[PDB]
UniProtKB/Swiss-Prot annotation:
Residues of the full protein shown: 8 to 314 of 898
Positions annotated as active site in the UniProt record: 140 (proton acceptor)
Protein name: Serine/threonine-protein kinase TAO3
Residues annotated as signal peptide: none
Function: Serine/threonine-protein kinase that acts as a regulator of the p38/MAPK14 stress-activated MAPK cascade and of the MAPK8/JNK cascade. In response to DNA damage, involved in the G2/M transition DNA damage checkpoint by activating the p38/MAPK14 stress-activated MAPK cascade, probably by mediating phosphorylation of upstream MAP2K3 and MAP2K6 kinases. Inhibits basal activity of the MAPK8/JNK cascade and diminishes its activation in response to epidermal growth factor (EGF).
Protein kinase domain residues: 17-270
Recorded family membership: Belongs to the protein kinase superfamily. STE Ser/Thr protein kinase family. STE20 subfamily.
Binding site for ATP: 23-31, 46
């Protein structure tokens, strides 16, 4: 019906975008760097197929992601440009980013610097405070869904699990980064935006340690351990106390004891002065490191030099 047709532009995207290069993938298909042939603008295109046996679920997921992106306007959420449709493939068009925070980890094969973590966290928190103020929940916060534009701005992306309401109940997320109350809700009970704060805490650990906790287990074992056991913490004592206190505050298992996004914006870790150029310099040092990679690793990370 019109409710669904109204989500999509009516012209054929195949002509409109040129010079496609893959920059990501997921179950749906790939993401591409592309240029509008008429305006020269560079964009990202997430192509999401709903062919085949999983057509119904795939189409519902497209619809949910498009409807969610349509409502957003904030400097730390990815800019949405609209969506095209061709041959059982939706072309979701976004502003183009250099890469994810997970990509920055992969290029360096080391944790990020603490001030880089803070900067990224700070931007992510603004996005989360916006979302939560609108009764929204991201539900899949992780380093691979926090992007950086080439100029150094932090963008939340991947709204494929997101909630249009709060409280919510669905058992959704990426298991290692899921809040205990999502797991304990078992698709029936309730949780709210603070699940993103738990996930942010896990993301902090990820950026500090290269991987989330429990990553040597299967999903089934991790979900049990997240529910049953004491929350994780930063392993190293090298980190400042402020960063360690930040993480611990995020990783309060009881939601009533965990800060909101608005509250965590006032925490010392993100309020502490840091250098003006932290994100610009992280970007530059990343490009410089991609230029030194061997061809095995470069083949995977060449997108970082696409501009
Ligand atoms: N707007 C974008 N600009 C640059 N890269 C992007 C953009 N959107 C996605 N990507 C890349 O594609 C990857 C997968 O996209 P994502 O939307 O997270 O898909 P999935 O839902 O299936 O995880 C990201 O982790 C990122 O590396
Ligand atoms: Mg993703």
């Amino acid at each position: 019906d019109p409710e669904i047709a109204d989500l999509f532009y009516k012209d054929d995207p195949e002509e409109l975008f040129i010079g496609l290069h893959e920059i990501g993938h997921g179950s749906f298909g790939a993401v591409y760097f592309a240029t509008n042939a008429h305006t020269s603008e560079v964009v990202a295109i997430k192509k999401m197929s709903y062919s085949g046996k999983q057509t119904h679920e795939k189409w519902q997921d497209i619809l949910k992601e498009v409807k969610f992106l349509r409502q957003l306007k904030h400097p730390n959420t990815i800019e949405y440009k609209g969506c095209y449709l061709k041959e059982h493939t939706a072309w979701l068009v976004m502003e183009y980013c250099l890469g994810s925070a997970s990509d920055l980890l992969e290029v360096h094969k080391k944790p990020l610097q603490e001030v880089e973590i803070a900067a990224i966290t700070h931007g992510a928190l603004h996005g989360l405070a916006y979302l939560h103020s609108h009764a929204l929940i991201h539900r899949d916060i992780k380093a691979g869904n926090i992007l950086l534009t080439e100029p150094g701005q932090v963008k939340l992306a991947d709204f494929g699990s997101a909630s249009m309401a709060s409280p919510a109940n669905s058992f959704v997320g990426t298991p290692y980064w899921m809040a205990p109350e999502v797991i304990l809700a078992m698709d029936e009970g309730q949780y709210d935006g603070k699940v993103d704060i738990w996930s942010l805490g896990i993301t902090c650990i990820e950026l500090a340690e290269r991987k989330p906790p429990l990553f040597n287990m299967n999903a089934m074992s991790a979900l049990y351990h997240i529910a049953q056991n004491d929350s994780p913490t930063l392993q190293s004592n090298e980190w400042t106390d402020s960063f360690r206190r930040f993480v611990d505050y995020c990783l309060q298992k009881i939601p009533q004891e965990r800060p909101t996004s608005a509250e965590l914006l006032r925490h010392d870790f993100v309020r502490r002065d840091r250098p003006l150029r932290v994100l610009i310099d992280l970007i530059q040092r990343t490009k410089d490191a991609v230029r030194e990679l061997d061809n095995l690793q470069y083949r995977k990370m060449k997108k970082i030099l696409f501009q």
